Amino acid sequence: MLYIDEFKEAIDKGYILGDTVAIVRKNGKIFDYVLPHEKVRDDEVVTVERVEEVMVELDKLEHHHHHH
User: Fold this and answer.
1) Which domain holds residue 18?
2) What InterPro entries does this protein's entry cite (predicted)?
3) Letter string b/e over residues 31-59, b meaning 16 or more CB atoms within 10 A of that residue's CB
């Protein structure tokens, strides 16, 4: 699974430019981003997604515990 830190860094460093991005999902979960010209295998499903929507989906894997 892809996590938010890597995704945000790829945006900050200019690998993921713009408002939509190619994504591969497995079982509905995001497993990687795919950059222009990168190759995928036949069993991979590549969709174009909103960068903001990806950021919400990746938040589902973050820790939110806020009691101490």
Assistant:
1) 2-68
2) Paratox-like
3) ebbbeeeeeeeeeeeeeebebeebeebbe
